[PDB]
């Protein structure tokens with residue numbers, strides 16, 4: 161009667177954490193369910209070792225959560241990756257005390273639908289982003305595949321698109337750049353997302369009160385896999401607290417409440433020397449207390465920037481993002497609009513200033529600013545990747561300073577919507593919330609679809 165689920169996340173510590181935290185919640189919804197996560201490069205990344213070890217070694221983690229390593233070599237393309245999953249799956253169905261409920265794949269792991277079809281087990285997809293991204297990606301896929309459209313026509317275009325999962329026209333400049341590029345880049349990602357509608361169910365990392373209009377549009381197509389908004393899935397306990405820092409907590413305790421603006425740009429926010437100097441100049445002219453996570457310093461910052469901003473701000477490298485946003489001193493967040501960073505800032509009621517860089521962050525910035533109105537914008541169409549030997553585009557310090565001033569105001573319609581949306585996010589995870597029911601409905605359908 162026991163049902164085992166196999167999760168296949170994309171390589172990296174990030175996508176693994178969201179898979180583990182989501183698995184920990186689904187296990188609490190049915191004691192008959194077990195989850196086995198396939199790790200792409202366990203014995204190669206020491207950060208993935210620590211996370212997998214500290215999770216399995218913890219007595220509070222469920223005993224029904226197993227981590228199995230995928231011994232991927234260097235030359236294995238999609239050919240050999242399929243077999244090493246097919247090998248483990250064939251070993252896992254030999255257990256007569258468990259029924260394989262199916263494969264739950266990542267957005268970049270939809271190639272293993274082949275394996276699920278060979279073993280006559282269902283296929284599922286865990287979308288680590290929001291519903292507005294899913295509907296947009298399927299709209300762009302249907303445009304090229306079903307309407308015979310050259311998606312490069314929207315590249316650097318001032319036109320707007322009528323996307324079904326959006327209540328406002330979506331500018332072509334906020335589209336995911338990899339979908340309007342063409343050639344090998346577009347082909348790689350189109351083969352990733354076009355196989356999603358061929359699954360049984362799609363788990364989305366969002367809640368209904370956030371991206372309503374998109375979820376209704378995704379569910380309207382009955383000829384499509386049912387979507388389960390199980391978010392927000394965050395990279396900490398979501399009930400105890402994230403790991404912090406003493407010297408960090410020391411300085412923020414001295415500043416007033418909602419007075420420090422935090423600046424972080426994810427794990428790939430490598431600006432050029434010019435853009436960093438514009439951010440530092442804007443922080444100087446704003447006069448606001450700031451905490452800047454910057455990835456030497458006196459050679460990349462304006463002359464005397466640290467000297468003039470000594471008692472008002474602090475600059476550093478890597479930052480405990482979730483812990484900093486939880487501090488009462490942080491009242492602003494200049495973010496790259498990553499979905500995890502967006503959900504973290506929403507979980508702690510911190511309003512955001514959009515500085516999107518890569519991936520779907522351009523659409524996430526458009527979603528929060530124009531669609532929902534719960535974020536001030538610095539830019540919506542900024543792209544960090546400069547092609548050829550061309551000079552990178554740069555956002556001026558005046559545009560950054562203006563958005564910080566609007567963000568750190570005592571009262572604003574953005575700050576009120578964020579505080580209101582923060583409670584709607586925390587209620588969605590409590591029993592009876594929208595995402596709680598979605599988790600229970602998902603685990604219910606996984607067991608019922610097996611016969």
Ligand SMILES: O=c1ccn([C@@H]2O[C@H](COP(=O)(O)OP(=O)(O)O)[C@@H](O)[C@H]2O)c(=O)[nH]1
Pocket residue numbers: 174395424425426427428453477478479480481482496497498499500501502504519
């Ligand atoms: O200095 C940093 C930068 C990032 N993060 C974490 O890295 C992720 C960044 O968010 P997201 O994955 O949406 O952005 P991306 O990694 O794609 O840039 C989140 O889990 C953050 O908590 C962090 O802890 N400290």
